[model samples]
Target chain A: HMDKLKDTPFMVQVKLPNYKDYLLDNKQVVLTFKLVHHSKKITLIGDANKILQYKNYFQANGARSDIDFYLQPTLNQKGVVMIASNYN
Target chain B: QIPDHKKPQYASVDDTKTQALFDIYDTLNVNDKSFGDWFGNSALKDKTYLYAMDLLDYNNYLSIENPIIKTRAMGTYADLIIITGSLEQVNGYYNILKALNKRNAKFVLKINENMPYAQATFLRVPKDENKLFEQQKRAYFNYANDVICRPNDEVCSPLRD
Candidate 1:
């Protein structure tokens, strides 16, 4: 099941109940992410915070796309995730 | 090997600057040989094929119409060049840029060391500076719309236009 997620599109909906603390008017956030399954887990490789920041921008502007977006865990203060695309 | 005659011309910035440019060319040749070795190894090629495809797709997505302008953009907007993998994995990318440069695409190459992945971007020195800024603004607005605003969202309503 996890392996099938590779090359697939998905969506992620994050609910931050205390979004007020983050200066967000809404409690829920939605974003898209592309998934690549490696070793036994599906991961969205990129800077989590940067991705979240873009998601926040997308959310605020009401951007929607058919592209896959996976919601991973919230980013720590200084988190960076790096993964290669299937293209070398 | 990049033929000595085919080497990229370096502006007389300084001795240090010229040496740095030469180093990049030398490194590019070394990397090319490394890539050749990997490509010859079926196992390595198989492992990297998918990753390579992704890079090609990304490249195609950013394709520009005019070859000269595209080269200029790639050179100027080195930040726009997004590659994955370690420094060793950037040979393909460097080759791409070098090819563009060989074709008279003029722009300075800038690498982002802070990024864990290999990526570069270029900006074109537009012919009309004023119109370029306007176009850039519109592009940003469109990008926001594509990435954020929903079709029916009041925030991005066409009625506001």
Candidate 2:
């Protein structure tokens, strides 16, 4: 049954148009993670926000879990977006 | 100095301790698979202290009014509230929390048979760091040992898996 499903340690991706331009426009960049099964927490990092540390917890809902985060540009933030997670 | 609670204390940052705490936050941030494992291996626990710094100005440091909870080695700063809901909802709460001093905060935690996730907010005043830490720790252990898994299950199983 689990064969079709992607193995754990997968990445969640979000594509934005003119990522740099939108960021320069001070657009509120938002990131969301949909969890399969259950996950303890979500961590976000990247060059865009210079947010070296971002953390949030997940509530187990047999039906996938979602985590949404917003970024208000501070200083000069630019570049790709990235997110990773662990069951712990 | 701006009142008793609003004043910034120019204390030298403890690199070692600060680094440790930062590393802890980093692990929590990146979702370290070993976090739960490391957290549970020790029945003998060490004390973890919580500190707050002005996000805008790192030099501006203030002690939160709430007490942090600690038990069976696990601990968390209660004064730090978790904002939930969608991005907009969290951003709204973030602004609200920013306006309120650390003194005006509270936390409501819910524990269940599954992994525990607690929500907190700074809606009131007189932040008690000590109390906040203590309460958070107790809540964690209470859920960790009794609810999250069976007594016979390895405490670090979640992390190990």
Candidate 3:
């Protein structure tokens, strides 16, 4: 069931909550990312205080998209997750 | 090997960023507000084919009509400015903005290094059309002149209007 974002070019980025600042694409709420190669797996690292935020982001945007972006456990200063992607 | 085959020279780094910029902009987001203003005015918002075919220059903010770049340029402001131009052309335009003393305006358009065609988006573009057209034309003429009068501040100095 896993498709390939392999051998071709693609991008990945994280969307964190930022109510204090403004972004070009309204960076506060939306996730903004620079382009990255497909060979790489992006890591989402955040504090436990915002665990639910990351979880819900995965829940909302991950739907119907190529990658079933999900939340991984274990945190104190940093919580981590990975997005398996198929840019096909 | 073919006798007189030429090396690949077309898409060195052209197509990706173009679509990438749009990918972030035009994606279906019920919460996206960057394009909120266009929702009220642009008839072309629903024209996916037109968007896919690249009507960005035409459908720019400010809705300029004095010069009539294209009637389709919506009634939006020039807040989000994207400059996708080749080497000299882009530099020419940028030089003008750099020279201006408008402290309120900041040149935050991030251009990639060494790419033939590039994108540099300037945020917080205040609303103005004719003046924009006039300034844009002036920049173009200055840059066109630069090709001939490049180097030597003395030769190019007189033409820096």
Candidate 4:
């Protein structure tokens, strides 16, 4: 008998109307991926004003920042495509 | 002889095994992979050197501000840091690397038993081989003996160009 069920390669994405404006000194935005019951969210760290301006956009999508090591976001307006992640 | 602690862990862009290649894979668990793997197999090793040299020039040419390009460029540079160290013997890029918070995390040659010690691995050209695909075609990876052609070899060849 199988003990657990799981969906592999869960996809994550977010939308920001002003995404182009928000970028870190590295010229990238941070996406903190988390795993609480496989919970995933994104958190940005660059311009506080920029982030707050579009705060509603992030909050509406699956986004959270529990101090995860910053990650870079892709530029597909539809949102970035990623896999289960071998690195993390 | 390069010590085990100071060799670039080879990899490919589109696979899960590349994950374990990260030096901090065990302790920190950062989901990192390398596009530099192409350089790894192609460099056969020194090709790694050439890849960075071009980047060094591109770094100056673009004086890059595009974050997305910076990310990919940094991934490959990280491979250099993987093989080299904080007291990196390599000539330059210290300024930019310092800003990036240069970490000495390395990519190990061996991840575990399931993953054999293959020096370099390259996949068949993608269905949609981008402009870079031509470069991929030019470099030869001797997947059979884990050998790759060194640039300027008296007798060397590209698998397909």
lDDT of 2 by residue, A1-88 (tens): 0111111111110111221222232111111211211223333334433433322222223222354433333545443233333332
Q: Which residue runs does candidate 4 get wrong by more than 4 Å?
A: A1-27, A31-88, B1-93, B101-161
**How many clashes would you count in candidate 3?**
2
Ordered by lDDT, highest first, the candidates read 1, 3, 2, 4
For every prediction, compared with the true complex, DockQ reads: 0.04, 0.02, 0.02, 0.02
**Which regions of candidate 3 fall more than 4 Å away from where they truly are?**
A1-32, A35-49, A57-67, A76-84, B1-161
Question: Judged by TM-score relative to the true structure, which candidate is superior, 1 or 2?
Answer: 1
Please provide TM-scores, in order, for all candidate models, with all chains considered together: 0.20, 0.18, 0.23, 0.19
Encode model 3's per-residue lDDT on A1-88: one tens digit a residue: 0112111211111111111111122221111111011212233334443434544443334432322333344555432333323232
Per-residue lDDT of candidate 1, residues A11-71 (tens digit): 1111111112212211111001221211112233334555454334323233233223443
The top-ranked prediction according to lDDT is 1
Model 4: per-residue lDDT, tens digit, B6-103?
23333342454332122211111112222222111211211111110001112221222222232322333232222122222111223333344333
- The local lDDT score (0 to 100) that residue B91 gets in candidate 4 is 15
Q: Which ten residues in a row have the lowest lDDT in candidate 1 chain B?
A: B18-27
- Please tell me which predicted candidate would have the highest DockQ against the true structure: 1
TM-score of chain A of each: 0.24, 0.23, 0.30, 0.23
Worst 10-residue lDDT window for candidate 3 chain A reads A10-19
List candidate 1 stretches off by more than 4 Å: A1-49, A56-64, A74-77, A82-88, B1-100, B105-161
